[PDB]
mmCIF file of C-alpha atoms and ligand atoms in Angstrom:
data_model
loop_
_atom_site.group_PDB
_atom_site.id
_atom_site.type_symbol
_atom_site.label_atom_id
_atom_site.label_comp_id
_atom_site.label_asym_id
_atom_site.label_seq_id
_atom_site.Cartn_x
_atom_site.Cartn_y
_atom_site.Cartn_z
ATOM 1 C CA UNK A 1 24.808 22.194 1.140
ATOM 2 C CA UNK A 2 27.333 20.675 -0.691
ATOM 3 C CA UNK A 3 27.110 20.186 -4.533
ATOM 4 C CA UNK A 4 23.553 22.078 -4.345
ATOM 5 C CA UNK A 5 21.829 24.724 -6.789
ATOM 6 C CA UNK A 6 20.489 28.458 -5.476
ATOM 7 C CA UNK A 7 16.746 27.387 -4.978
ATOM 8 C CA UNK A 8 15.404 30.955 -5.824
ATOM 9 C CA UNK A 9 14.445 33.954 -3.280
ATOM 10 C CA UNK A 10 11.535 32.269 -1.086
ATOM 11 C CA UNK A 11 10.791 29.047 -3.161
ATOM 12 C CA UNK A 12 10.741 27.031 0.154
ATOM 13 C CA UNK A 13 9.003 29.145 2.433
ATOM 14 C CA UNK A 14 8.922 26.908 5.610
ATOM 15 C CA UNK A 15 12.792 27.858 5.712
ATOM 16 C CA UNK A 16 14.002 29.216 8.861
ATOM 17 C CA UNK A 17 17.688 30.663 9.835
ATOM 18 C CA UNK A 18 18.332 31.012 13.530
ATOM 19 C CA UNK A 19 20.494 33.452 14.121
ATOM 20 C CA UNK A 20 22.445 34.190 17.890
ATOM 21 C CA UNK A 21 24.485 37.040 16.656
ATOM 22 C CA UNK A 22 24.854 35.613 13.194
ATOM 23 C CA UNK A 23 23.170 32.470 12.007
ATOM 24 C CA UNK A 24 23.835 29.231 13.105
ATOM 25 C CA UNK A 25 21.808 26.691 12.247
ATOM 26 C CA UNK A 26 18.195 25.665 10.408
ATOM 27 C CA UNK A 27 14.734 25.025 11.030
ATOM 28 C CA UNK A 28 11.259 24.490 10.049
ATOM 29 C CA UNK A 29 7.920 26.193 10.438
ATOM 30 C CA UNK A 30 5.146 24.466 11.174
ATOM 31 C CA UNK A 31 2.749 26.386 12.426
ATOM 32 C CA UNK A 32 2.808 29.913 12.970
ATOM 33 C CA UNK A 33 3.824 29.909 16.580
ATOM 34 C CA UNK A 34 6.257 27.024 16.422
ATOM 35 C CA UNK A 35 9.689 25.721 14.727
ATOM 36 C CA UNK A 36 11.075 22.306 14.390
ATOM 37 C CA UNK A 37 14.980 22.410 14.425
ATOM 38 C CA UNK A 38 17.836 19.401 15.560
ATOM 39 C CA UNK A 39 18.530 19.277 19.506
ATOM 40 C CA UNK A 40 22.132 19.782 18.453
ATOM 41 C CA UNK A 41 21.663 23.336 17.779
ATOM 42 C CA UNK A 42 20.342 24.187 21.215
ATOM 43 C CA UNK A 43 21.703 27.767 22.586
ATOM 44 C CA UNK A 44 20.099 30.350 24.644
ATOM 45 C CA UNK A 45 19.388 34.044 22.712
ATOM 46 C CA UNK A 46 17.623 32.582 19.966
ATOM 47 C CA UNK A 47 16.421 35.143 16.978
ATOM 48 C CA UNK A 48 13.599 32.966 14.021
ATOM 49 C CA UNK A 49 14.456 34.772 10.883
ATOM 50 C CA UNK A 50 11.618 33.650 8.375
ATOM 51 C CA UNK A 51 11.146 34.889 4.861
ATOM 52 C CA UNK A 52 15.012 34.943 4.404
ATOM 53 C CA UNK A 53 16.697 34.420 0.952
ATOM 54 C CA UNK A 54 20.195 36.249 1.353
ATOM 55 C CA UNK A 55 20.698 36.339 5.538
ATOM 56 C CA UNK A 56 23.112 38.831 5.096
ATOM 57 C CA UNK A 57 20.822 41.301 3.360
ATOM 58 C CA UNK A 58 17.447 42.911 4.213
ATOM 59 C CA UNK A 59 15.355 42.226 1.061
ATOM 60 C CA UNK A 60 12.149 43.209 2.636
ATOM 61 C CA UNK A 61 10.448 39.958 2.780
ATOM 62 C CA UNK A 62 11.781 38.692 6.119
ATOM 63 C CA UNK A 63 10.129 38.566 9.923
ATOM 64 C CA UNK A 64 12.483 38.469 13.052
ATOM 65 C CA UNK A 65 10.660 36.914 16.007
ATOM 66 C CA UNK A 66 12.653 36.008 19.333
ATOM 67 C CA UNK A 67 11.907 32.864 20.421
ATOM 68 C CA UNK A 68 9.924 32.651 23.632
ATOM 69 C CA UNK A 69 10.856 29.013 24.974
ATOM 70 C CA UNK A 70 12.646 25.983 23.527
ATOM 71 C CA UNK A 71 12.317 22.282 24.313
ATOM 72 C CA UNK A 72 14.656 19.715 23.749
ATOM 73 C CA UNK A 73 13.233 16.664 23.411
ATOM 74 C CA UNK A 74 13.143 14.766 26.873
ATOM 75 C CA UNK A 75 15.283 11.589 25.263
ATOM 76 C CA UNK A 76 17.933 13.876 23.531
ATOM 77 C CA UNK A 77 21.257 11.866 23.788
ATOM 78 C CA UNK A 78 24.102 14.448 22.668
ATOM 79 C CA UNK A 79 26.481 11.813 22.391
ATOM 80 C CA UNK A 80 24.699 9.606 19.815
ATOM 81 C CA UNK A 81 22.306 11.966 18.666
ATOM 82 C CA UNK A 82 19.653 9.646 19.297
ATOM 83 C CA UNK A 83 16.130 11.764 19.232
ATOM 84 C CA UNK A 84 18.312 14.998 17.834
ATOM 85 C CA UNK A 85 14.680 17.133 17.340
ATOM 86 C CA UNK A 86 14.168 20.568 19.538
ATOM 87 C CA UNK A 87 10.886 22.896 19.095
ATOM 88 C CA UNK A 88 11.089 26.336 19.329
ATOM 89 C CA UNK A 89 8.199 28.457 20.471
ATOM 90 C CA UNK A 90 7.852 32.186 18.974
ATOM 91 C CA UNK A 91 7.078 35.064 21.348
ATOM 92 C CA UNK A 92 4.943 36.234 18.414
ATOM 93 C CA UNK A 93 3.238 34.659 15.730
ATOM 94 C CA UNK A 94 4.344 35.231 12.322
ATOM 95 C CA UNK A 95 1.934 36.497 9.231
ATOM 96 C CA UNK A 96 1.796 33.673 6.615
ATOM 97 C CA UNK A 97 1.824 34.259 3.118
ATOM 98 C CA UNK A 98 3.308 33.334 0.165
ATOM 99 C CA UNK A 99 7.280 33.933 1.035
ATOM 100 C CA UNK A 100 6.368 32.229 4.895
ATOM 101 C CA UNK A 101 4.407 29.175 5.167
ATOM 102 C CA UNK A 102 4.294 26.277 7.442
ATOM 103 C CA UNK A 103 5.343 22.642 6.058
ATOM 104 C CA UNK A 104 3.229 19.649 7.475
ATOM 105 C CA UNK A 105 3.944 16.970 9.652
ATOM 106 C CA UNK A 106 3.880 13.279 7.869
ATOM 107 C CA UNK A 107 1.081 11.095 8.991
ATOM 108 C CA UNK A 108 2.973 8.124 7.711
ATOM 109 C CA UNK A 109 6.464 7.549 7.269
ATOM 110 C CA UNK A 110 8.808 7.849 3.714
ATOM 111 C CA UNK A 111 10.679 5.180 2.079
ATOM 112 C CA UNK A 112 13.600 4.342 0.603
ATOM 113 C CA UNK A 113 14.250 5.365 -2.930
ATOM 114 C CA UNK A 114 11.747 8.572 -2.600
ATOM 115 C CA UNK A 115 13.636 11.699 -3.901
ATOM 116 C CA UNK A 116 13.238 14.854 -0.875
ATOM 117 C CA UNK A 117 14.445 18.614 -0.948
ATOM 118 C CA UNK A 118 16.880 19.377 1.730
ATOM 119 C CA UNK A 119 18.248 23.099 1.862
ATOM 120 C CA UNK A 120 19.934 26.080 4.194
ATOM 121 C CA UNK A 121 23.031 28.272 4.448
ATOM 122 C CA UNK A 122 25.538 25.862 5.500
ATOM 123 C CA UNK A 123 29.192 25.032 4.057
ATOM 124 C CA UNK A 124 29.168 24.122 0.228
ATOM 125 C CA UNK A 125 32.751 22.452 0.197
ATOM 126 C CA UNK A 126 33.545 18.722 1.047
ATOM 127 C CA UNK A 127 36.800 19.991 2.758
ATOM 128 C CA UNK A 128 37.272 23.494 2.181
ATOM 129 C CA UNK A 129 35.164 26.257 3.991
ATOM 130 C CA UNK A 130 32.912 28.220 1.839
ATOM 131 C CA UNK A 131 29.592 29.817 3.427
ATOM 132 C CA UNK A 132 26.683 31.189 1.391
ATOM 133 C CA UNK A 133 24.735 34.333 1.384
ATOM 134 C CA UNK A 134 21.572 32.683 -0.648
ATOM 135 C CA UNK A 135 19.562 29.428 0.169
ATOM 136 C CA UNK A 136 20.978 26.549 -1.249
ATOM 137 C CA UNK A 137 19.478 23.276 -1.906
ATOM 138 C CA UNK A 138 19.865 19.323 -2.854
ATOM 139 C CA UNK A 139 17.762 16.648 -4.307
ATOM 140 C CA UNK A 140 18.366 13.612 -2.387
ATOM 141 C CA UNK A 141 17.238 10.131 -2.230
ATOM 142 C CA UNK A 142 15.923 8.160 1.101
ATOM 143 C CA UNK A 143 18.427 5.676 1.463
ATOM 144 C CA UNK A 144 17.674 1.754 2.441
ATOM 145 C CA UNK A 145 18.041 1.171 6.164
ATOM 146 C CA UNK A 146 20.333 -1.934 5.269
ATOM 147 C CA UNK A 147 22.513 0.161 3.487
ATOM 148 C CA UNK A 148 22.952 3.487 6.316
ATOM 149 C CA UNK A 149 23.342 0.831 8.971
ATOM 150 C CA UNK A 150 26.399 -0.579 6.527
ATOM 151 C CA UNK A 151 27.612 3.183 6.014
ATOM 152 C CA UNK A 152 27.635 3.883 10.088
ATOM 153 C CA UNK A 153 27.903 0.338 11.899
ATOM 154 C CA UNK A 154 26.883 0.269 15.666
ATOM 155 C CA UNK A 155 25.840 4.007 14.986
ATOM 156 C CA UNK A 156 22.275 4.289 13.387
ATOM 157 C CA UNK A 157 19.107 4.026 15.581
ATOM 158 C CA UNK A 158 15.308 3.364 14.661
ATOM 159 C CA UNK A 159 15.031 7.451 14.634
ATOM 160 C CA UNK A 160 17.336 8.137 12.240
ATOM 161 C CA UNK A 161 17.681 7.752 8.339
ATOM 162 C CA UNK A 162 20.471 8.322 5.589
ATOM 163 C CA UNK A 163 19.501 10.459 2.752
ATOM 164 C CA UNK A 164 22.011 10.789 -0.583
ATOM 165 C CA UNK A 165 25.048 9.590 -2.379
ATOM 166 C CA UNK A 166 27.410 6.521 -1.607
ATOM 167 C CA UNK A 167 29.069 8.199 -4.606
ATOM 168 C CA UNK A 168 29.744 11.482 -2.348
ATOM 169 C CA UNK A 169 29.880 15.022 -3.975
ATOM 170 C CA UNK A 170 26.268 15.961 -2.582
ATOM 171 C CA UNK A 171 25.567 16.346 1.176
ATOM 172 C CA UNK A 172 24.048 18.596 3.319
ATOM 173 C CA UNK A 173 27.003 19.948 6.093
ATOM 174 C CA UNK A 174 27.673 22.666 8.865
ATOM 175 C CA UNK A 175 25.351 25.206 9.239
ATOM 176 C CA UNK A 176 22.532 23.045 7.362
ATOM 177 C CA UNK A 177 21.585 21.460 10.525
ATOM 178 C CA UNK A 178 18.673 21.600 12.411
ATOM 179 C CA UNK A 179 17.211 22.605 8.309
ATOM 180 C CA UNK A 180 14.047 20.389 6.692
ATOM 181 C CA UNK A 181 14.145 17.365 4.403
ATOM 182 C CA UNK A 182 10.722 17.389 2.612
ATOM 183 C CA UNK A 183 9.344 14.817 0.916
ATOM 184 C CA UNK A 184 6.047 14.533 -0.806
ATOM 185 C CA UNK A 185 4.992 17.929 0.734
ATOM 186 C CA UNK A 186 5.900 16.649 4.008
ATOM 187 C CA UNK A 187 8.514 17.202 6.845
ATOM 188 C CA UNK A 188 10.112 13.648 7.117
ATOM 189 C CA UNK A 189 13.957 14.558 8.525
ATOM 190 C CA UNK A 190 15.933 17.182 10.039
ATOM 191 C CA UNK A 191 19.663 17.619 9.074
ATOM 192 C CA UNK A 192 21.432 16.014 12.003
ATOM 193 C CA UNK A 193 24.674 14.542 11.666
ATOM 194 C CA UNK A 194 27.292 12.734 8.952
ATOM 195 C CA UNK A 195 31.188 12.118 8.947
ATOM 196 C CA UNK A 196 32.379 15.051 7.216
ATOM 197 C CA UNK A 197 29.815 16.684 4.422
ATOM 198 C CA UNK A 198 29.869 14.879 0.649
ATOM 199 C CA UNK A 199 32.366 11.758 0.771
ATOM 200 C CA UNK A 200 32.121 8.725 -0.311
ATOM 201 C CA UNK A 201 30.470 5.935 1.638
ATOM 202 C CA UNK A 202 29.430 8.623 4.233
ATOM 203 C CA UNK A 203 26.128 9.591 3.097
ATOM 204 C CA UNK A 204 23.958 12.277 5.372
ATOM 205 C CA UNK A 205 22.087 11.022 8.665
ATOM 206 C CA UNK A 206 18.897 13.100 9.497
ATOM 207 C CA UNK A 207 16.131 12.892 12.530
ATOM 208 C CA UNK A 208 13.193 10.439 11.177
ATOM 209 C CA UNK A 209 10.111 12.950 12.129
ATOM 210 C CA UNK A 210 7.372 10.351 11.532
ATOM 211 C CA UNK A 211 8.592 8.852 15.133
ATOM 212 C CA UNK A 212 8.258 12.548 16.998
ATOM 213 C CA UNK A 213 4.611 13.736 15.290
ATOM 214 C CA UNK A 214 2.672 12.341 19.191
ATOM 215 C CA UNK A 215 5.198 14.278 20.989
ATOM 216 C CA UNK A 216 5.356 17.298 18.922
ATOM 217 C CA UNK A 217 1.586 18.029 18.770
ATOM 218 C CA UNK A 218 1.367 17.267 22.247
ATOM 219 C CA UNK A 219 4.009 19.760 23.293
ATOM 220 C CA UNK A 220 2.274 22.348 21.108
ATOM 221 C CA UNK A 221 -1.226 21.558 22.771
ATOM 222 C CA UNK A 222 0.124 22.421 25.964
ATOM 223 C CA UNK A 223 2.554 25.486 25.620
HETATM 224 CA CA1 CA B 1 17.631 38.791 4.176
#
């Protein structure tokens, strides 16, 4: 998260780090057998950490479950990231409480102009490399369709939305994908793509949920 603020040890519990060695990329819980993170961040080995405020620190509030399967969704497109969504199934389910709690699934899509929370432990510079130790996280707005499309011509499809600043300066980036945008108490976007993190004209593009909620209860009826 670029041009973020420290959100506070275990303010947004629903916060996942996977971690293959070291961690690589976000997620969400919703349920507590079963994370929601970008297709992009697909890899074999995967360790849920949930509960995490400072990933390179044991704080005491955290629980490490090995995933058990993962699914890509079936239309993933790696070249466009068309349908960039992946759910990961834990071999265990994890105790919920106040530091780790699921976020739920919209019933009806968000708009433009409504304000979300996006966080995780990605890069917080526009062109330098600087990687935190704490969650991070960003107010951002849902931008118009009209105006991504405009951003990212010939590049943004009916399952995708932009979320931020024209103005740059505040992005999500590397190592923030696969993380939650929440909005109204609800999981409406995972952190998928953008060119470059924070400039101008080049605001974030993120997986529109609302078109995945048949597929993902579905998939979690049946495995
Ligand atoms: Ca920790």
């Amino acid at each position: 998260i670029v041009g973020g603020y420290t959100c506070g040890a275990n303010t947004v519990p629903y916060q996942v780090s996977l971690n293959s060695g070291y961690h690589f990329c976000g997620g969400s819980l919703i349920n507590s057998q079963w994370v929601v993170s970008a297709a992009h961040c697909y890899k074999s080995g995967i360790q849920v950490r949930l509960g995490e405020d400072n990933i390179n620190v044991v704080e005491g509030n955290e629980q490490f479950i090995s995933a058990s399967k993962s699914i890509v969704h079936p239309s993933y497109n790696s070249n466009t990231l068309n349908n960039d969504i992946m759910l990961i199934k834990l071999k265990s389910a994890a105790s919920l409480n106040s530091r780790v709690a699921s976020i739920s699934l919209p019933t009806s899509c968000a708009s433009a102009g409504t304000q979300c929370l996006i966080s995780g432990w990605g890069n917080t510079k526009s062109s330098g490399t600087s990687y935190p130790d704490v969650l991070k996280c960003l107010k951002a707005p849902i931008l118009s369709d009209s105006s991504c499309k405009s951003a990212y011509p010939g590049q943004i499809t009916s399952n995708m939305f932009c979320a931020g600043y024209l103005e740059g300066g505040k992005d999500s980036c590397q190592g923030d994908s696969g993380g939650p945008v929440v909005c109204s108490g609800k999981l409406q976007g995972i952190v998928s793509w953008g060119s470059g993190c924070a400039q101008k004209n080049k605001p974030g593009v993120y997986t529109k949920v609302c078109n995945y909620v048949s597929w993902i209860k579905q998939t979690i009826a049946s495995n």
